Coordinates of all heavy atoms in Angstrom, one line a residue:
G367 N -52.2 11.7 10.3 CA -51.4 10.5 10.2 C -50.7 10.1 11.4 O -50.6 10.9 12.4
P368 N -49.8 9.0 11.3 CA -49.0 8.7 12.3 C -47.7 9.5 12.5 O -47.4 10.3 11.6 CB -48.6 7.2 12.0 CG -48.7 7.2 10.5 CD -49.8 8.1 10.1
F369 N -47.1 9.4 13.6 CA -45.9 10.1 13.9 C -44.7 9.2 13.9 O -44.9 7.9 14.1 CB -46.0 10.9 15.2 CG -47.2 11.9 15.2 CD1 -48.2 11.6 16.0 CD2 -47.1 13.1 14.5 CE1 -49.3 12.5 16.0 CE2 -48.1 13.9 14.5 CZ -49.3 13.7 15.2
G370 N -43.5 9.7 13.8 CA -42.3 8.9 13.5 C -42.2 8.5 12.0 O -42.8 9.2 11.1
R371 N -41.4 7.5 11.8 CA -41.0 7.2 10.4 C -42.0 6.1 9.8 O -41.7 5.0 9.6 CB -39.6 6.6 10.3 CG -38.5 7.4 11.0 CD -37.2 6.7 10.7 NE -36.1 7.5 11.4 CZ -35.4 8.5 10.9 NH1 -35.8 9.1 9.8 NH2 -34.4 9.1 11.6
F372 N -43.3 6.5 9.6 CA -44.3 5.7 9.2 C -45.0 6.0 7.9 O -45.8 5.3 7.4 CB -45.4 5.6 10.3 CG -45.0 4.7 11.5 CD1 -44.2 5.4 12.5 CD2 -45.4 3.5 11.6 CE1 -43.9 4.5 13.6 CE2 -45.1 2.7 12.7 CZ -44.3 3.3 13.7
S373 N -44.7 7.2 7.3 CA -45.3 7.5 6.0 C -44.3 7.9 5.0 O -43.2 8.3 5.3 CB -46.2 8.8 6.3 OG -47.1 8.6 7.2
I374 N -44.6 7.5 3.7 CA -43.8 7.7 2.6 C -44.5 8.7 1.6 O -45.7 8.6 1.5 CB -43.4 6.5 1.9 CG1 -42.5 6.7 0.7 CG2 -44.6 5.7 1.4 CD1 -41.8 5.6 0.1
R375 N -43.8 9.5 0.9 CA -44.4 10.5 -0.1 C -44.2 9.9 -1.5 O -43.2 9.3 -1.9 CB -43.5 11.8 0.0 CG -44.1 12.8 -1.0 CD -43.2 14.1 -0.8 NE -41.8 13.8 -1.0 CZ -40.9 14.6 -0.4 NH1 -41.1 15.6 0.4 NH2 -39.6 14.3 -0.7
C376 N -45.4 9.9 -2.2 CA -45.5 9.4 -3.6 C -45.7 10.5 -4.5 O -46.6 11.4 -4.3 CB -46.6 8.4 -3.7 SG -46.6 7.0 -2.4
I377 N -44.9 10.7 -5.5 CA -45.0 11.7 -6.5 C -45.7 11.1 -7.8 O -45.1 10.1 -8.3 CB -43.6 12.3 -6.9 CG1 -42.9 12.8 -5.5 CG2 -43.9 13.5 -7.8 CD1 -43.7 14.0 -4.8
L378 N -46.8 11.6 -8.2 CA -47.5 11.1 -9.3 C -47.4 12.1 -10.5 O -47.7 13.3 -10.3 CB -49.0 10.9 -9.0 CG -49.4 9.5 -8.5 CD1 -48.6 9.2 -7.2 CD2 -50.9 9.5 -8.0
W379 N -46.9 11.6 -11.6 CA -46.7 12.4 -12.8 C -47.7 12.0 -14.0 O -48.2 10.9 -13.9 CB -45.3 12.3 -13.4 CG -44.2 12.7 -12.5 CD1 -43.4 11.8 -11.8 CD2 -43.7 14.0 -12.3 NE1 -42.4 12.5 -11.0 CE2 -42.6 13.9 -11.3 CE3 -44.1 15.3 -12.7 CZ2 -41.9 15.0 -10.8 CZ3 -43.4 16.3 -12.2 CH2 -42.3 16.3 -11.3
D380 N -47.9 13.0 -14.9 CA -48.6 12.7 -16.1 C -49.9 12.0 -15.9 O -50.8 12.4 -15.1 CB -47.6 12.0 -17.0 CG -46.3 12.7 -17.3 OD1 -46.4 14.0 -17.5 OD2 -45.3 12.2 -17.3
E381 N -50.2 10.9 -16.6 CA -51.5 10.2 -16.5 C -51.9 9.9 -15.1 O -53.0 9.9 -14.7 CB -51.6 9.0 -17.4 CG -50.7 7.8 -17.1 CD -49.3 7.8 -17.6 OE1 -48.9 8.9 -18.2 OE2 -48.6 6.9 -17.6
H382 N -50.9 9.4 -14.3 CA -51.1 9.1 -12.9 C -51.7 10.2 -12.1 O -52.6 10.2 -11.3 CB -49.9 8.5 -12.3 CG -49.1 7.6 -13.1 ND1 -49.4 6.3 -13.4 CD2 -48.0 7.9 -13.8 CE1 -48.5 5.8 -14.2 NE2 -47.6 6.7 -14.5
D383 N -51.0 11.5 -12.4 CA -51.5 12.7 -11.7 C -52.9 13.0 -12.2 O -53.8 13.1 -11.5 CB -50.6 13.8 -12.2 CG -51.1 15.2 -11.8 OD1 -52.1 15.4 -11.1 OD2 -50.5 16.2 -12.3
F384 N -53.1 13.1 -13.5 CA -54.4 13.5 -14.1 C -55.5 12.6 -13.6 O -56.6 13.0 -13.3 CB -54.3 13.5 -15.7 CG -53.1 14.3 -16.2 CD1 -52.5 13.8 -17.4 CD2 -52.8 15.4 -15.7 CE1 -51.5 14.5 -17.9 CE2 -51.8 16.1 -16.2 CZ -51.0 15.7 -17.3
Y385 N -55.2 11.2 -13.5 CA -56.2 10.3 -13.1 C -56.5 10.4 -11.6 O -57.7 10.3 -11.2 CB -55.7 8.9 -13.4 CG -56.6 7.7 -13.0 CD1 -58.0 7.7 -13.4 CD2 -56.1 6.7 -12.1 CE1 -58.8 6.7 -12.8 CE2 -57.0 5.7 -11.7 CZ -58.3 5.7 -12.1 OH -59.1 4.7 -11.6
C386 N -55.5 10.5 -10.8 CA -55.7 10.5 -9.3 C -56.0 11.8 -8.6 O -56.6 11.8 -7.5 CB -54.5 9.9 -8.6 SG -54.2 8.2 -9.0
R387 N -55.7 12.9 -9.3 CA -55.7 14.2 -8.6 C -57.1 14.6 -8.1 O -57.2 15.2 -7.0 CB -55.2 15.3 -9.5 CG -56.0 15.6 -10.7 CD -55.2 16.5 -11.6 NE -55.2 17.9 -11.1 CZ -54.1 18.5 -10.6 NH1 -53.0 17.9 -10.6 NH2 -54.2 19.8 -10.2
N388 N -58.1 14.2 -8.7 CA -59.5 14.4 -8.3 C -60.3 13.1 -8.0 O -61.4 13.0 -8.2 CB -60.3 15.2 -9.3 CG -61.4 16.1 -8.7 OD1 -61.5 16.2 -7.5 ND2 -62.3 16.6 -9.5
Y389 N -59.5 12.1 -7.6 CA -60.0 10.8 -7.4 C -59.6 10.1 -6.1 O -60.5 9.7 -5.3 CB -59.6 9.9 -8.6 CG -60.1 8.5 -8.5 CD1 -61.4 8.2 -8.5 CD2 -59.2 7.5 -8.7 CE1 -61.9 6.9 -8.5 CE2 -59.6 6.2 -8.7 CZ -60.9 5.9 -8.6 OH -61.3 4.6 -8.6
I390 N -58.3 10.1 -5.9 CA -57.8 9.5 -4.7 C -57.9 10.6 -3.6 O -57.6 11.7 -3.8 CB -56.3 9.1 -4.9 CG1 -56.1 8.2 -6.0 CG2 -55.7 8.5 -3.7 CD1 -57.0 7.0 -5.9

């Protein structure tokens, strides 16, 4: 990815985790 202040961390819990973990 890019360098510098260009990326944000997203924390996915519960259904969002279960849905995205093997999808996104």
